Amino acid sequence: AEGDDPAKAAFDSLQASATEYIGYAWAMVVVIVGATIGIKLFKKFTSKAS
Amino acid sequence: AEGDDPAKAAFDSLQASATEYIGYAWAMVVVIVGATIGIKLFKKFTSKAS
Amino acid sequence: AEGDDPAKAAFDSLQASATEYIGYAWAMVVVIVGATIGIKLFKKFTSKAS
Amino acid sequence: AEGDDPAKAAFDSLQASATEYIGYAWAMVVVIVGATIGIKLFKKFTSKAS
Amino acid sequence: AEGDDPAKAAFDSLQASATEYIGYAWAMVVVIVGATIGIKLFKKFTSKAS
Amino acid sequence: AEGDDPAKAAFDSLQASATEYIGYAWAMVVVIVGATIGIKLFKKFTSKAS
Amino acid sequence: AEGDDPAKAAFDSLQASATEYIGYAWAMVVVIVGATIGIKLFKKFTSKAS
Amino acid sequence: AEGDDPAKAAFDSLQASATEYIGYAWAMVVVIVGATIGIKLFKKFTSKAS
Amino acid sequence: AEGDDPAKAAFDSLQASATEYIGYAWAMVVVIVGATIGIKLFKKFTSKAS
Amino acid sequence: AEGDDPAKAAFDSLQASATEYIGYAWAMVVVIVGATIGIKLFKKFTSKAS
Amino acid sequence: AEGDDPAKAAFDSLQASATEYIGYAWAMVVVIVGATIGIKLFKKFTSKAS
Amino acid sequence: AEGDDPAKAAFDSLQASATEYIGYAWAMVVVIVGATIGIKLFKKFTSKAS
Amino acid sequence: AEGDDPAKAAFDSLQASATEYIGYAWAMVVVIVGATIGIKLFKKFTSKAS
Amino acid sequence: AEGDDPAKAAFDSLQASATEYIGYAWAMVVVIVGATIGIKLFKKFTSKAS
Amino acid sequence: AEGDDPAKAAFDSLQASATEYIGYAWAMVVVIVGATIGIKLFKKFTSKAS
Secondary structure (H helix, E strand, O other), X not given: OOOHHHHHXXXXXXXXXXXHHXXXXXXXXXXXXXXXXXXXXXXXXXXXXX | OOOHHHHHHHHHXXXXXXHHHHHHHHHXXXXXXXXXXXXXXXXXXXXXXX | OOOHHHHHHHHHHHHHHHHHHHXXXXXXXXXXXXXXXXXXXXXXXXXXXX | OOOHHHHHHHHHHHHHXXXXXXXXXXXXXXXXXXXXXXXXXXXXXXXXXX | OOOHHHHHHHHHXXXXXXXXXXXXXXXXXXXXXXXXXXXXXXXXXXXHHO | OOOXXXXXXXHHHHHHHHHHHHHHHHHHHHHHHHHHHHHHHHHHXXXXXX | OOOHHHHHHHHHHHHHHHXXXXXXXXXXXXXXXXXXXXXXXXXXXXXXXX | OOOHHHHHHHHHXXXXXXXXXXXXXXXXXXXXXXXXXXXXXXXXXXXXXX | OOOHHHXXXXXXXXHHXXXXXXXXXXXXXXXXXXXXXXXXXXXXXXXXXX | OOOHHHHHHHHHHHHHHHHHHHHHHHHHHHHHHHHXXXXXXXXXXXXXXX | OOOHHHHXXXXXXXXXXXXXXXXXXXXXXXXXXXXHHHHHHHHHXXXXXX | OOOHHHHHHHHHHHHHXXXXXXXXXXXXXXXXXXXXXXXXXXXXXXXXXX | OOOHXXXXXXXXXXXXXXXXXXXXXHHHHHHHHHHHHHHHHHHHHHHHHO | OOOHHHHHHHXXXXXXXXXXXXXXXXXXXXXXXXXXXXXXXXXXXXXXXX | OXXXXXXXXXXXXXXXXXXXXXXXXXXHHHHHHHXXXXXXXXXXHHHHHO
């Protein structure tokens, strides 16, 4: 009980922080996927011309 | 007997506390797996465009 | 049992979110395929004239 | 014997729970594969027009 | 001799019990591997369509 | 020996299930290829007229 | 010496069992590869018509 | 909190750098697609003469 | 009481020092992950060209 | 001296026995790697057809 | 030395087996390419008539 | 404090060294990606001729 | 420092070797592309006659 | 010193043996890549005919 | 003081010896990584041909 209270709260803080990192992950992949969408579009142009 | 009663109860309390920690574990992994599902979905988009 | 309940629900939420992403995927490809239909139609005109 | 009985049963419960998670897995992949079937169909249209 | 007889038998019982646990292990992994076979099959479908 | 028997049988069941999925795969591609045969036939008509 | 004899034999049995599992592996992949050969053949038909 | 601050910033820097690489990607494909547009134009001339 | 005071403070100092080491850890992994982001970007270029 | 002689010899015997076990290890991994070579070859066939 | 001898030989056997699989691969593709040569010849006839 | 100072500095040196290795990594991938750009360009020529 | 020097040099040697392989790659594709240029030229003759 | 001499030499022998295994690795991949070069050549023929 | 002097020196010798072992480690991994660079290059060739 008493001992595990501060620890439970600590785990909550750790979980929230994990969520912050995870948000950054979603974003990073937003850039990479953005790059893939654009570049694959270049390829699309090329094929249409072909 | 007499001596081990309080100890048995103490072990029950310890086990329950362990269950609390364990619940937090399931949750933490819920966030991480959520991140993996979303980001792998970004990758899915990229491949479909490709 | 008890521990895996919150986790099952979490997985449901994750699955639904996956469905949202997936809807966006169908749409994105709607635009790309729209582009292919139109442009291939331009090619059709050219061939008919030829 | 005596000690390992409750443990055997516990393992049964754990195995069943594992089956629940696993069912959710089959489903999640049902959505993802559904997305792949549909989107690859969009690509099919595009190629046929081409 | 005399003292170690009951102990040898006890070790036999312990070994047999260990075998029971171990059987449950083989099974648990049967479910997990079953899940992997099925889901990887979903992926197979997706690739074939692609 | 003893331990691996149930596991061998489990693997047999898994293999058979894999065969079921695989049958569905052959079918799915039957529809897609059917679509390609028909539509390419439309193209055939067009060229013959041309 | 004496102690490691039964253990060497045990390892032989374990190795043989491993061979049984491994045979099942070769087979499972026989089905999957069979599926890939057939389905890729469907794709072949489609392309030839195209 | 305290520990994850420097890490969040580090991830920001990493994301920005990723954007730089990605810009170079868009450019590289600009050259390749430029090549495809020009060369397919050569083919266009040839067909028109034909 | 009296004896454990200096020890509590000592543990505080030890904990803070642990935090310093831990900061260095976050940083070290910042470099490694930076390397992975860049190099995986090289791979991205290669695939886009492909 | 005198006491450690029989012990040195005992250690030699133990080392040799360890070598026997170790030989079995190399073999066991021979089977597993054999399985991986064959099955990855099945995958090779599939890709070539694709 | 001693330990790695049997392993080297095992690797030789594995390599030879790999060669057998690989021969089957060359053959399988012989059939597929044979099919492509014949069918493309049908197309040749059609065009010549056209 | 006192004990962890030399260790902090040691970790700094280790981190810097890690950066050196990492630089070599970026370079190695520069060669590999260079190879991919060139060779994919060969493929580009072939397709343009086709 | 001291430890990572020999390793840095080792990485240099590895990188150079990678360059050798890569040169062979450029060449191999020189032959394949040569084949494509020639054969597509055969096709050119055929079309001109047509 | 004295104790680590035999160990250093032992490590040399182990490293050399590792080199033998590694040579076999380069070879095994020589066969696999040979198979890929040949079979991809079959595909080349098919496309040229097409 | 007096007693710990010879021990400090002994620890220095032990540390230096540890450095020797560690050098051998860097080397061993030089061979393994060399093998990975070469073999992955074989794979590179195969993909380029594909």
